[PDB]
Design a protein around this ligand. Structure first.
Ligand SMILES: [K+]
Ligand SMILES: [K+]
Ligand SMILES: [K+]
Ligand SMILES: [K+]
Ligand SMILES: [K+]
Ligand SMILES: [K+]
Ligand SMILES: [K+]
Ligand SMILES: [Mg+2]
Ligand SMILES: [Mg+2]
Ligand SMILES: [Mg+2]
Ligand SMILES: [Mg+2]
Ligand SMILES: [Mg+2]
Lengths: 191, 130, 111, 243, 177, 205
RNA sequence: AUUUUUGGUAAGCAGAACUGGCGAUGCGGGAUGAACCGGAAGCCGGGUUACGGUGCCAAACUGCGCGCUAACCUAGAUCCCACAAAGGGUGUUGGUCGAUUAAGACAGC
RNA sequence: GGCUUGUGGCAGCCAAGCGUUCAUAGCGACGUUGCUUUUUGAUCCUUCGAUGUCGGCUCUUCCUAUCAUUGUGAAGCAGAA
RNA sequence: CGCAUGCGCCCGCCGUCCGCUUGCCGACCCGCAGUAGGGGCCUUUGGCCCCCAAGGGCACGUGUCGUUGGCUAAGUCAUCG
């Protein structure tokens, strides 16, 4: 029914710099740089500075927006929160190898930017996966048959994990019985 | 962002219809499409927002004020003089004057413009040569 | 500044010949539809109501030491709302004049 | 009603129309993709079918029944005398495709090449390129040629050399009219391509400068003509009953 | 000031007879584009609800009702019953307008737009002026703000009149809120 | 749409961010009325409904072909300029001499080729996306659709347009410097002519 | 052909009642059409309409207004008319009747 | 060939039951809504100063309500089938 | 891109004549991007100003397509190198 004003605000930690211009959000922190293009959202983004204190707030609002349009405000705020988390703490995904008979042989290429899977269900084919930008994959030493993906972009890290998982799908078998694969087991922050 | 909002006391310009060129004050809001407007030389009435162009002028008034109160607020804010002095307001006045010019006045203006253009061209050529 | 060679004074406006008064399936060439440059409303047509018009064109042969030919006409009434006018000429305009320019003069004058 | 039984259609619709080719010499329709990180090299060549023979060789193919066994294979002989380079052509990239910008010819052209520009060479006065050659004699002329080459370097996107065969060397052919063709130069920058083309003016390029042993190549040409033909032989349709 | 819909008070009765020398007088508040149509609807309702036909009836009075203060905004509540493609239903709606005539026009337009109900398929049961605190619909309650403030999100660009309209423009329109 | 009614030798239109159908209708009326139109930057034309819908529509169009002789038409052009030309022909009686002349009075180009790179280019408000399409609704670029359906010159157009825009930026900077010099010269000349400035004052914006 | 109406699953089937129409009749509209809508006609000028329309084709607004729809099935687009049903949707938009709630409503801690 | 679709053929909805227990893995009684014109009927609009009347052979193209082949979801899918 | 005809052909200037024209009459005008923004000044993190259509700007624009003679700084337009 076109609610007049739907607004939501988020606090910004003092250790992160943020710039907004034409719905282009630039985030800077100790771990590096992140960028997002929110041009596809018909929302108004504003950065409020507290002169007396010096703190930062990001306010996103929609005017005369329907429910569908208003649903994007929280999405944008969560995306900005994820950017801040990635630039301050970073993102770490953990994957575990699951197999019944054939151990999965994983080889990490140079730079921790590519992975080779060789013995999935005793298959002679070699599966190649390349990590996305800013995401590095390593083989854990404290946990058996575990892969650690570290990055600054939650979306890129999760997409790399999804690529690894989907590259090892079982076919022509009852997947309920043949549970072999590589699956995401934990999501968290590097620090 | 959003330098202008529709508000109680906001001065708008009628940009369409028989009342084009007139300043009105938004004294109330009926709904998302129309608002209640007033002014010294009309009867308070509803108008669609599509026929209004918001200005940068705003007066301090309560909703649906009396005619005398509205006039006093407008005079205190000096809405007329500010609008006339602003480039946006001066545009309509200049268009009206240009339309109102007559044949002899247009000839005199043409002579003045030709002389000014000649002098400006001489000055610019000398400036370039310097 | 320009150095042009042509008419030194213009005392007329231009009018594009749109066609004839017509329905979807019928045509009446006795009346012509003319769009006058700068006229955008039937209210503005009131000034030009009754003004003389000339359709100038060239012929292969010479008449009175000239290839020019002229068919005179005048504005009768407005057509539609967008400024188009209905016009009547001494003879029906040829269909080949469609898209061509006629001269709308300032006479007969009412001011 | 549907056809009673199914079989694949006779012939291919991808070679339509089955008309006489508009040319006698094979035309290169697409040149190899150019990689600028390689030395300048010609992409094509012209040869002449001589005949066929057969060879025997020992096959090295592990897993095959022919491994370490003799095999007899038919081969074709193509005579490929060195091609003489006589010019350079440059093209500019445009929204409408490649547009020829300018052509620069060498000072000296052989009679075999000049024969390609006449229908009756003997009856003519043989005036081809006579005024063009004089551009290499007047100082302004070589300057103009160098300026044309510089413009080609500046604006061209793909470079092709003009090369003609030394047909009279093969007396078995009764032809003195050489075959001329454009051969693309792949590798290097545009300036490198232009310099490589210019350095080969009035010079021979052997076949081994383009192709080498064990290389896979493509052969373009006009098939043997057979004239008017019925459907049975032209398309492979089956014969109707005797009666 | 022209309203498409006008409010009429229509007063009528049955023709006096020997049995009833002074028959009961009935009054109705009706909405119609004209007094003729108002009287027609009055007679329809009288026939349907009181067994009094126009032929054996008498028309005593008909008067227009105008808004007391068309200069001020009011909240209007309308109770109506309408016919859909599969039955009849009751419906209460709220509007904001300077006049109940404008409110009724809005009601007719909204019924047509949202339910594909034609004018003749709508019967108005009740109309009232609702105070701000008693309004039930968010559409009207969201404008009950002492400090109402919002920008003009959607504005159509056009010249003051077609006199200044031109097919071609040297530059694209410059728009900013 | 009666027609523009202007008297000009030709009109150059920058079709960037113009709705295809509305621009085509307006230009068809102009051509029928007898105007000469040159459309540039056809690859920047906007189509409502989105890339998916427009691509399915173009595939449906590509399905059409004379079964016994596909060379007999319909002819499916891929370039944005040809698409605009065919769309305009769809709104013109092109099978008559009048329609043929109206079509012949039309030129369509991709990008801004010469000499139109140095000629003033106009826009049609009635077909502008900013005025006709609500922000958020789906639309696609005609160039993108053409590239998807088999146009292989988008990159060349992009490169040439970038070069042209750089040159135009240089020219604009030069013009801005010239304008500043002209303003300073006007300031210098202000004192010379008093009465003329007095006469011009009530008319200056 | 509207309405009434018989046989037949039904039919652009077959048969009856009243009136009108086509046949014998052009003309404007329904793209196109014997029956539909309008309307019936000597040869012309001017004015205005009927049905139907006013983005182009194509004469008349991209006219002034309010809502709904987003169709990744060829979204949809005007009596006859050139078809679509029962069942469904946590797509979205209004209404009706109920239940909990600042002695603090629902989900996670 | 045209209207229709009873008949023929091909689908859907509800859920009493079947399926070691469990309506819906796989089916669907009693009922009920549709689609199609490769069945056969019904009709008689076109053709009787004539449209060559079965089937086969040859040849092309088109449809999907998909037999096989490519990629997938589900199972009363351990594997195989 | 080559070559282009010995009462021939081609190019440039001057006088005259004819024919075609997509319709001369000031037939003047190159920024990009965006429209939930853009730009300038001042630079406090900041403040002020502009937009809100070429609805503008330019142009002896002034003389029978424009009378007779002479001078002519600067400016501008045209033609030729
Ligand atoms: K068959
Ligand atoms: K056979
Ligand atoms: K059936
Ligand atoms: K029959
Ligand atoms: K017969
Ligand atoms: K057989
Ligand atoms: K002059
Ligand atoms: Mg078959
Ligand atoms: Mg009738
Ligand atoms: Mg008449
Ligand atoms: Mg079960
Ligand atoms: Mg299927």
């Amino acid at each position: 029914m076109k609610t007049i004003l739907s607004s939501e605000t988020m606090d910004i930690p003092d250790g992160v710099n943020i710039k907004v211009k034409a719905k282009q959000i630039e985030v800077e922190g100790p771990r590096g740089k992140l960028t997002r293009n929110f041009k596809h959202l018909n929302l108004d983004f504003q950065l409020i500075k507290d002169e007396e204190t010096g703190k930062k707030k990001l306010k996103i609002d929609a005017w005369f927006g329907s429910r569908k349009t208003t649903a994007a405000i929280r999405t944008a705020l969560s995306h900005v929160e994820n950017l801040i988390t990635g630039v301050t703490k970073g993102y770490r995904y953990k994957m575990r190898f699951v197999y019944a008979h054939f151990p999965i042989n994983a080889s990490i290429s140079g730079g921790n930017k590519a992975i080779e899977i060789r013995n999935f269900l005793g298959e002679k084919r070699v599966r190649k996966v390349d990590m996305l930008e800013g995401v590095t994959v390593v083989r854990s030493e404290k946990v058996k048959d575990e892969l650690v993906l570290d990055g600054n972009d939650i979306e890129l890290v999760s997409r790399s994990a999804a690529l690894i998982n989907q590259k090892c799908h079982v076919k022509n078998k009852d997947i309920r019985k043949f549970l072999d694969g590589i699956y995401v087991s934990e999501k968290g922050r590097i620090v | 962002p959003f330098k202008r909002f529709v508000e109680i006391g906001r001065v708008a310009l009628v940009n369409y219809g028989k009342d084009y060129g007139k300043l009105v004050v938004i004294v109330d809001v009926i709904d998302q499409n129309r608002a209640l407007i007033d002014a010294p030389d009309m009867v308070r009435s509803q108008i669609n927002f599509k026929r209004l162009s918001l200005t940068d002028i705003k007066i301090d008034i309560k909703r649906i004020p009396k005619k005398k109160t509205l006039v006093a607020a407008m005079e205190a804010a000096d809405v007329k003089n500010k609008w006339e002095s602003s480039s946006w307001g001066r545009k309509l006045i200049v268009q009206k004057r240009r339309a109102s010019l007559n044949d002899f006045d247009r000839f005199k203006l043409m002579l003045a413009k030709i002389k000014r253009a000649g002098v400006v061209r001489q000055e610019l050529a000398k400036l370039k040569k310097e | 500044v320009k150095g042009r060679q042509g008419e030194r004074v213009r005392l007329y406006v231009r009018g594009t010949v749109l066609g004839y008064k017509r329905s979807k399936s019928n045509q009446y060439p006795s009346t012509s539809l003319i769009q006058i440059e700068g006229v955008n409303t039937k209210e503005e047509v009131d000034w030009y109501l009754g003004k003389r018009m000339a359709y100038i064109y060239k012929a292969k042969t010479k008449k009175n030491n000239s290839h020019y030919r002229c068919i005179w006409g005048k504005v009768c009434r407005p057509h539609g709302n967008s400024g188009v006018v209905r016009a009547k000429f001494k003879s029906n305009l040829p269909p080949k004049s469609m898209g061509s320019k006629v001269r709308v003069f300032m006479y007969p004058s009412n001011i | 009603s549907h056809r009673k039984f199914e079989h694949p259609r006779h012939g291919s619709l991808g070679f339509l129309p089955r008309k006489r080719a508009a040319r006698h010499r094979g035309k290169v329709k697409a040149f190899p993709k150019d990689d600028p990180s390689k030395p300048c090299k010609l992409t094509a060549f012209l040869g002449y079918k001589a005949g066929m023979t057969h060879i025997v060789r020992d096959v090295e193919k592990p897993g095959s029944k022919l491994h370490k066994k003799e095999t007899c294979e038919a081969v074709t002989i193509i005579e490929t005398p060195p091609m003489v380079i006589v010019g350079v052509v440059g093209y500019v990239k445009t929204p409408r495709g490649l547009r020829c910008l300018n052509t620069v010819w060498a000072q000296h052209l052989s009679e075999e090449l000049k024969r390609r520009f006449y229908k009756n060479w003997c009856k003519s006065k043989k005036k081809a390129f006579l005024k063009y050659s004089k551009k290499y004699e007047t100082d302004e002329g070589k300057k103009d040629i160098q300026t044309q080459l510089e413009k080609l370097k500046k604006y061209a996107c793909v470079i092709r050399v003009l090369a003609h065969t030394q047909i009279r060397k093969m007396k078995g052919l009764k032809q003195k009219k050489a075959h001329l063709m454009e051969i693309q130069v792949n590798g290097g920058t545009i300036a490198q391509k232009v310099d490589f083309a210019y350095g080969f003016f009035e010079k021979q390029v052997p076949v081994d400068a383009v192709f080498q042993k064990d290389e896979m190549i493509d052969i373009i040409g006009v098939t043997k003509g057979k004239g008017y033909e019925g459907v049975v032989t032209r398309w492979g349709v089956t014969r109707l009953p005797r009666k | 000031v022209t309203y498409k819909f006008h409010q009429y008070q229509v007063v009528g009765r049955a023709l006096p007879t020997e049995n009833d020398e002074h028959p009961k007088i009935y009054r109705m508040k009706l909405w119609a584009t004209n007094e003729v149509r108002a009287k027609s609807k009055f007679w329809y309702y009288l026939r349907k609800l009181k067994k009094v036909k126009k032929s054996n009836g008498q028309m005593l009075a008909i008067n227009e009702i105008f808004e007391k203060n068309p200069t001020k905004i009011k909240n209007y509540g309308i109770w109506l019953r309408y016919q859909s493609r599969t039955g009849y239903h009751n419906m209460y709606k709220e509007y904001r307008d300077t006049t109940l005539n404008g409110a009724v026009e809005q009601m007719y337009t909204e019924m047509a737009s949202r339910h594909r109900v034609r004018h003749h398929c709508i019967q108005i049961i009740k109309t009232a002026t609702i105070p701000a605190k008693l309004c039930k619909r968010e559409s009207t309650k969201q404008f009950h703000d002492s400090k109402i403030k919002f920008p003009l999100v959607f504005k159509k660009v056009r010249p003051p009149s077609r006199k200044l309209k031109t097919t071609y423009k040297a530059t694209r329109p410059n728009l900013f809120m | 749409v009666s027609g523009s009614g202007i008297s000009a030798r030709r009109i150059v239109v920058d079709a960037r961010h113009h709705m295809l159908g509305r621009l085509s209708s307006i230009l068809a009326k102009e051509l029928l009325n007898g105007q000469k139109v040159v459309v540039v930057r056809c690859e920047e034309i906007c189509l409502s409904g989105g890339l998916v819908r427009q691509k399915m529509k173009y595939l449906r169009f590509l399905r059409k072909r004379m079964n016994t002789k596909p060379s007999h038409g319909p002819i499916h052009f891929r370039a944005p300029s040809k698409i605009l030309w065919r769309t305009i022909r769809g709104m013109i009686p092109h099978k008559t001499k009048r329609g043929a002349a109206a079509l012949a009075r039309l030129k369509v180009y991709e990008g801004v080729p010469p000499p139109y790179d140095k000629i003033k280019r106009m826009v049609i408000p009635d077909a502008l996306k900013v005025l006709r399409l609500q922000a958020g609704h789906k639309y696609c670029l005609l160039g993108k659709l053409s590239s998807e359906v088999g146009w292989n010159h988008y990159d060349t157009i992009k490169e040439l347009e970038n070069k042209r825009k750089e040159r135009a930026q240089v020219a604009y900077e030069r013009r801005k410097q010239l304008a500043k010099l002209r303003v300073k010269a006007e300031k210098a000349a202000e004192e010379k002519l008093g009465p003329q400035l007095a006469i011009i004052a009530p008319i200056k914006y």
